[PDB]
Amino acid sequence: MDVSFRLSGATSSSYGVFISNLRKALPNERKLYDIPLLRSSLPGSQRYALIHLTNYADETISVAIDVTNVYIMGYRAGDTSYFFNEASATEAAKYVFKDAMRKVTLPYSGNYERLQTAAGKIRENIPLGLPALDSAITTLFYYNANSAASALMVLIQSTSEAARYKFIEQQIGKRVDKTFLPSLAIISLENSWSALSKQIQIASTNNGQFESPVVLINAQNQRVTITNVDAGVVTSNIALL
Ligand SMILES: [Ca+2]
Numbered sequence: 001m002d003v004s005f006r007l008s009g010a011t012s013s014s015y016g017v018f019i020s021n022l023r024k025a026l027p028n029e030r031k032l033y034d035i036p037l038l039r040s041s042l043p044g045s046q047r048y049a050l051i052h053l054t055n056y057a058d059e060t061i062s063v064a065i066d067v068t069n070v071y072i073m074g075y076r077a078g079d080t081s082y083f084f085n086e087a088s089a090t091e092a093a094k095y096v097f098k099d100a101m102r103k104v105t106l107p108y109s110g111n112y113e114r115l116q117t118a119a120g121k122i123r124e125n126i127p128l129g130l131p132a133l134d135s136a137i138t139t140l141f142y143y144n145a146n147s148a149a150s151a152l153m154v155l156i157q158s159t160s161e162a163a164r165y166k167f168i169e170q171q172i173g174k175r176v177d178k179t180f181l182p183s184l185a186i187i188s189l190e191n192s193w194s195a196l197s198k199q200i201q202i203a204s205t206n207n208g209q210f211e212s213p214v215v216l217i218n219a220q221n222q223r224v225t226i227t228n229v230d231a232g233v234v235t236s237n238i239a240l241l
Helices: 012-024 087-095 112-119 130-141 148-164 166-173 184-204
Strands: 004-006 028-032 035-038 048-054 060-066 071-077 080-083 102-105 209-217 223-228
Touching: 004 012, 012 148, 012 166, 028 184, 048 130, 060 087, 060 130, 060 148, 071 087, 071 130, 071 148, 080 087, 112 148, 130 148, 130 166, 148 166, 148 184, 166 184, 184 209, 184 223
Parallel strands: 004 048, 080 102
Antiparallel strands: 028 035, 048 060, 060 071, 071 080, 209 223
């Protein structure tokens, strides 16, 4: 289906549906503990998915996602494509937005270390929420090299990260007419996603137990360590492995 999200008329529920639809567009190798396990490898023609986002002023950006790991590869605004300077994104450009009249290769890869350096700010200090996403879209639709990095981080957390965790989806979706600075808990989840997924996978081969504890930060700003699949983050939060 055409997976889109319109900020004009948005509600917490319409954002939840958009994120649910985005997760459903991702092929699954199978499920582990009721959580979809992403395909570890796919041929280019089956590897990328698109989602479309419209800001309050009815301006739209289309976003390319690598279905193997939910990473954002690039976006399109009108007749121009923009891809991250990284191997996976170069491949993505061979399969999506192929008919863009103009193409540009962003100055950096899609990793937070590179984007934070390019933006001069860390995720902790960049407001999220639906109004934040509207502004990021406007900022990306009228591309400017000096402002794209920060907006891309808002876009990425609003899509990929929300898709990976129900807590993140919920937290962003609840801010309909206000923004908010993400908590260390949100940052901890994003940072620990590959480590956590890997431990859940390993847990399935170890009678439900992690081989390496995963230390996280909860909503109360407290450190808490996860060691098995009975943990709330595994049973009621992570949505993709
Ligand atoms: Ca994998």
